[PDB]
Design a protein around this motif. Structure first.
Motif, PDB file in Angstrom:
ATOM      1  N   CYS A  26      54.306  51.242  34.920  1.00 20.69           N
ATOM      2  CA  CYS A  26      53.557  50.941  36.151  1.00 20.69           C
ATOM      3  C   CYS A  26      53.929  51.882  37.306  1.00 20.69           C
ATOM      4  O   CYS A  26      53.052  52.458  37.966  1.00 20.69           O
ATOM      5  CB  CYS A  26      53.795  49.483  36.569  1.00 20.69           C
ATOM      6  SG  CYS A  26      52.960  49.029  38.114  1.00 20.69           S
ATOM      7  N   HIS A  28      55.997  50.874  39.972  1.00 23.68           N
ATOM      8  CA  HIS A  28      56.479  50.095  41.150  1.00 23.68           C
ATOM      9  C   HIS A  28      58.002  50.193  41.255  1.00 23.68           C
ATOM     10  O   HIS A  28      58.695  50.229  40.243  1.00 23.68           O
ATOM     11  CB  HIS A  28      56.053  48.593  41.103  1.00 23.68           C
ATOM     12  CG  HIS A  28      54.727  48.299  41.753  1.00 23.68           C
ATOM     13  ND1 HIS A  28      53.820  47.468  41.162  1.00 23.68           N
ATOM     14  CD2 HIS A  28      54.249  48.696  42.961  1.00 23.68           C
ATOM     15  CE1 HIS A  28      52.813  47.383  42.009  1.00 23.68           C
ATOM     16  NE2 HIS A  28      53.027  48.104  43.112  1.00 23.68           N
ATOM     17  N   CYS A  45      56.956  42.871  37.010  1.00 19.23           N
ATOM     18  CA  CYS A  45      57.020  44.048  37.908  1.00 19.23           C
ATOM     19  C   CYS A  45      56.738  43.672  39.378  1.00 19.23           C
ATOM     20  O   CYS A  45      56.119  44.453  40.115  1.00 19.23           O
ATOM     21  CB  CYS A  45      56.025  45.108  37.385  1.00 19.23           C
ATOM     22  SG  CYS A  45      55.908  46.630  38.370  1.00 19.23           S
ATOM     23  N   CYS A  48      53.063  43.341  41.284  1.00 19.07           N
ATOM     24  CA  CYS A  48      51.816  43.193  40.489  1.00 19.07           C
ATOM     25  C   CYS A  48      52.031  42.280  39.250  1.00 19.07           C
ATOM     26  O   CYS A  48      51.067  41.972  38.544  1.00 19.07           O
ATOM     27  CB  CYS A  48      51.334  44.577  40.030  1.00 19.07           C
ATOM     28  SG  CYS A  48      52.348  45.266  38.689  1.00 19.07           S
ATOM     29  N   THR A  50      53.259  42.845  36.346  1.00 16.62           N
ATOM     30  CA  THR A  50      53.082  43.526  35.039  1.00 16.62           C
ATOM     31  C   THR A  50      54.401  43.514  34.235  1.00 16.62           C
ATOM     32  O   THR A  50      55.475  43.468  34.823  1.00 16.62           O
ATOM     33  CB  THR A  50      52.605  45.003  35.269  1.00 16.62           C
ATOM     34  OG1 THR A  50      51.416  44.991  36.061  1.00 16.62           O
ATOM     35  CG2 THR A  50      52.324  45.765  33.959  1.00 16.62           C
TER      36      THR A  50
HETATM   37 ZN   LIG Z   1      53.740  47.101  39.131  1.00 15.04          ZN
END
Ligand SMILES: [Zn+2]
Ligand SMILES: [Zn+2]
Length: 61
Positions: A26, A28, A45, A48, A50
């Motif tokens: 991702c 982040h 994550c 978000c 994820t």
């Molecule tokens: Zn993320």
């Protein structure tokens, strides 16, 4: 407080400490203390939610 404009790359979850870890694939980012404490709860994550496949040390230079 909720401030987008930080003094440095300060982890927005914490304010006190900066970013040092990226959450791939991702991308982040937050402080290392975030994910280590977070692995006691989830493996998501944050910003978000994820699945974090790999937590790498994001170098800022
Ligand atoms: Zn993320
Ligand atoms: Zn943090």
């Amino acid at each position: 407080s909720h401030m987008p404009t930080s003094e440095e790359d300060l982890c927005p979850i914490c304010y006190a400490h900066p970013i040092s870890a990226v959450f791939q694939p991702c991308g982040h980012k937050s402080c290392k203390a975030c994910i280590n404490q977070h692995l006691m709860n989830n493996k998501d994550c944050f910003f978000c939610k994820t699945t974090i496949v790999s937590v790498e040390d994001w170098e800022k230079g």
